[PDB]
Amino acid sequence: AEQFAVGEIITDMAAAAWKVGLPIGQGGFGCIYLADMNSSESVGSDAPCVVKVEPSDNGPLFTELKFYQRAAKPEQIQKWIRTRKLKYLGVPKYWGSGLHDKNGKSYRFMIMDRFGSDLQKIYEANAKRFSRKTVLQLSLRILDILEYIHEHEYVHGDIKASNLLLNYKNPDQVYLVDYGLAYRYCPEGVHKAYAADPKRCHDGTIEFTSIDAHNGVAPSRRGDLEILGYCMIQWLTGHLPWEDNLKDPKYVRDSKIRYRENIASLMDKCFPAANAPGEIAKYMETVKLLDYTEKPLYENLRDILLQGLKAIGSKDDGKLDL
DSSP states (O other): OOOOOTTOEEEOTTOOEEEEEEEOOSSSOSOEEEEEEOOSSOOOTTOSEEEEEEETTOHHHHHHHHHHHHHOOHHHHHHHHHHTTOSOOOSOOEEEEEEEEETTEEEEEEEEEOEEEEHHHHHHHTTSOOOHHHHHHHHHHHHHHHHHHHHTTEEOSOOOGGGEEEESSOTTOEEEOOOTTOEESSGGGOOOOSSOOTTOOOOOOTTTOOHHHHTTOOOOHHHHHHHHHHHHHHHHHSOOTTTTOTTOHHHHHHHHHHHHHTHHHHHHHHSOTTOOOHHHHHHHHHHHTOOTTOOOOHHHHHHHHHHHHHHTTOOOOSOOOO
């Protein structure tokens, strides 16, 4: 069912006016349209925003909207960028939301930043490799994002290239999207217990998800860092050891557990003999030391990755080299 009449003007809860354009993909399958500020002109293919629209009873859009309202207000992001001395922060900006009735059905909508391409497309176009430079630069910026969200009570649980989108105007800035199944692991400073949460059904994306998720417990901070670890290997090598067995979750879990216990064997498996990037192993060893409720030392993880950039004769110059 069509949610909008194209070119209609929708008014958010803050009474800000927006105009709806044509559909656009942002790496997922939701109902997403181009959007801009209300003006006399039509919404173009270069629109700076999108509007996401779902039935009011859709659980994921409610979860996502609450994340964006709590953690992604423009001024809150800019304050963090200033105080932490960052170039940018890859958390999409929240511009407004509301309720829209059409044909007796109730819809929720949310206005957010419009982005360019997802990284999965670019990865596939590059024969399923990213360079060591690229992986390290992506990962440093993902660590900034994870630190931010974690400090705002949320974990993502589903970091992967299809959820990483480039700034529409700047292809050296990567953003993490899709908070529909994000989890508030620390509401009002109280950490969730080491157990399943009946409110949560999602287990992540099987090839990348954490051992915690495989064990049926709610995601926490160490899980997000573990997920990033698996992504880095996938990106560097084109493969993960368990990728032919993704229909068998117990096999995937068993493999991940074994390779966490023996990280040298993972490096031997995934990289040419005696030629493994040392920062990846050090990253995984550091994450391995985290307990379920423990606050990561993000600056230590970043330093590990910076040692990698030094080792290849480079520096953190913010260049993704895509």
